[PDB]
C-alpha cells in the first residue's frame, strides 16, 4: 500500500506505507480506525527525507557493514528542521 507525501512547492512523493511509518508524525496522521500534504517542507528537503525511509527499512536489522548517511552542508539546516518535526 502507498501514500502520496506532497511538499510545499508541490512535489508528490509516492512511497511505501511501511517506509512512511518510520515517521512518528506520519504514523499519527494515518492512524484512524492516502495522502498527506506538508505546507512548510520543501521538495529538496522531502525527497531526502523519503530516502531515510528506503534506507531505514533496508539497514535496520542488518548484520553487514552499514553505509553512512549523506548530508550536503546546504540541505543541512532544513533536514534537521524537517526531522525534528517529522520525528525520525
Amino acid at each position: 500500500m502507498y501514500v502520496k507525501l506532497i511538499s510545499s512547492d508541490g512535489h508528490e512523493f509516492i512511497v511505501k506505507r511501511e517506509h512512511a511509518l518510520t515517521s512518528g508524525t506520519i504514523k499519527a496522521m494515518l492512524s484512524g480506525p492516502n495522502e498527506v500534504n506538508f505546507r512548510e517542507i520543501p521538495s529538496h528537503v522531502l525527497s531526502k527525507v523519503c530516502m531515510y525511509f528506503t534506507y531505514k527499512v533496508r539497514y535496520t536489522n542488518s548484520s553487514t557493514e552499514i553505509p553512512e548517511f549523506p548530508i550536503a552542508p546546504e540541505i543541512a539546516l532544513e533536514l534537521l528542521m524537517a526531522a525534528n518535526f517529522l520525528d525520525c
Binding site: E65, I66, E68, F69, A76, L80, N84, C88
Partner: protein, 149 residues
Amino acid sequence: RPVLRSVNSREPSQVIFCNRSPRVVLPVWLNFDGEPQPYPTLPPGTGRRIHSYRGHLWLFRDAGTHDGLLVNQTELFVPSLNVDGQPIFANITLPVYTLKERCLQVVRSLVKPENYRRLDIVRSLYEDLEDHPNVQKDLERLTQERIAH
C-alpha cells in the same frame, strides 16, 4: 557495584576489533569499578587483535563527536572464551541513527561551539544541539535499560 562493570575473570580472551565504519573509533572499556576507560583509536577500515579478558565490557564511539557506534549489532560487547584457541571478533559499525541526530551531527561539526546560537532554527533545537551525545550518560541510559529487563 553498578551493573555494568568488567568481571575480574582473570582469563585471557584474544579479541579482534576491526572498525567497519567511516569514523575514527575509540574503544571504551568499563573496568572493575564500571568507570569507562580510553584505549588507542582505530582508523576507519582497519582492525587489530587485542588481548582482552573473558567477560570484559567494551563499547565503541566515534573518537570525534563521541557518537554511539555498534559492535556485532549491539551497543555492548562481551566475549566469552576462545574456543579451541581461535579468537573472538568485534565488528564495529555505524548504527542507523535517526535523521534527527544524523543532521545534528553535521550541523554540530560545521558550526563551532559558541555559534550554535546564530543558526536560524526553532528554539528547542539549540538544546538538541547543545546536548551532544555523552558516554557517561549512555551508561546511565543502559543500566536502567537492563534493570527493566
